[PDB]
From a paper:
Kinetochores assemble at centromeres by interacting with a variant histone H3 known as centromere protein A (CENP‐A) in vertebrates and as [name] in [name] and other point‐centromere yeast. More recent biochemical reconstitution experiments showed that the [name]‐[name] heterodimer, which is a Ctf19c sub‐module that binds the Ctf19 protein, is the direct binding partner of Cse4END (Anedchenko et al, 2019; Fischbock‐Halwachs et al, 2019; Hinshaw & Harrison, 2019). [name] and [name] are the only Ctf19c components fully required for mitosis (Ortiz et al, 1999; Pot et al, 2005). They associate as an elongated heterodimer with a globular “head” and an extended alpha‐helical coiled‐coil “shaft.
We determined a 1.8 Å resolution crystal structure of a truncated [name]‐[name] bound with a Cse4END peptide to specify in detail the amino acid residues involved, and we have shown by binding experiments and yeast genetics that the interaction is functionally relevant in cells. We determined the crystal structure of the Cse4END peptide bound to a minimal [name]‐[name] heterodimer. Crystals containing all three proteins, including the full Cse4END sequence, grew in space group P 42212 and yielded diffraction data to a minimum Bragg spacing of 1.8 Å. The ordered [name] residues in the crystal structure are mostly α‐helical (residues 34–46). The three‐way interface between [name], [name], and [name] has a hydrophobic core surrounded by polar interactions. Hydrophobic contacts between [name] and [name] include [name]‐L42 and [name]‐I234. Likewise, [name]‐L41 and ‐I34 contact [name] I195. Peripheral charged contacts include an electrostatic interaction between [name]‐R46 and [name]‐E235. [name]‐R37 makes complementary charge contacts with [name]‐D191 and ‐D194. In the current structure, the [name]‐[name] head tilts away from the shaft.
Numbering used by the authors:
A (entry chain A): 124 to 275
B (entry chain C): 32 to 49
C (entry chain B): 125 to 231
Write the structure that this text describes.
Amino acid sequence: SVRPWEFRKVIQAEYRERLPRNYELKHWKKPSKIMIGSILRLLETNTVSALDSVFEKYEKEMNQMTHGDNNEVKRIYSKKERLLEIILTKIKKKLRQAKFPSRISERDLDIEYIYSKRQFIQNRYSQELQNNERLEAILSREQNLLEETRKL
Amino acid sequence: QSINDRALSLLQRTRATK
Amino acid sequence: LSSSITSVTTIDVLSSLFINLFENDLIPQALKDFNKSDDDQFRKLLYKLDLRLFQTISDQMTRDLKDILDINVSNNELCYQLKQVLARKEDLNQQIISVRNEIQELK
């Protein structure tokens, strides 16, 4: 019964299929603009990429069906662009209207965020490892001193 | 190949859009 | 892995949402049109373009959401490793203090 365009329903069913019944699936919230924006930017990126991909692949068939009229080809490109934007517009409308568990971190869907977090945590890890290396050396020095002192 | 490589490639492609 | 499991799941839910939309709706409808268009060779080609366009977008969406999932899962592990190194740091500091105190009293 659930149709692919009913995003609110699909999303709630998918969560329920994947995770046990517990508190996390009890409060629900509409998504943030950056979640919507991140997802639509992914969709737009791939839509432009697909358009170029596909039109280049079928260039000869295209040019042979338009009898060399490259203006008509640009027109067909624009028609397909318009079809995809109308689709993406409904995707955005239905996603804005869907709900997600409130404990999720929607910024996890933003490549800018998770990329900048990863660079920082990698650097922080390297700094702390070196600090522990140094503390291990200091501790060793002190433990040697204690062993000598225990023997007077 | 790497996760960082893949991450940077996605970041670049999304920034090049709009 | 429980603090992040609902956020990781969100990425999979979205990936499944768009596979369902493209593979179980947009692409079947474009096929239904393309199979029906043997009289108009132009519209046959254009429906084929729709087919390829939806399949390309859907496959690439899945790959990019898997990228995002892999980054998050890897980041979460690194964050937990950072917690362990910081726990060890605090312990090394305390042990250094205790050993110094011991030297001070035995000296």
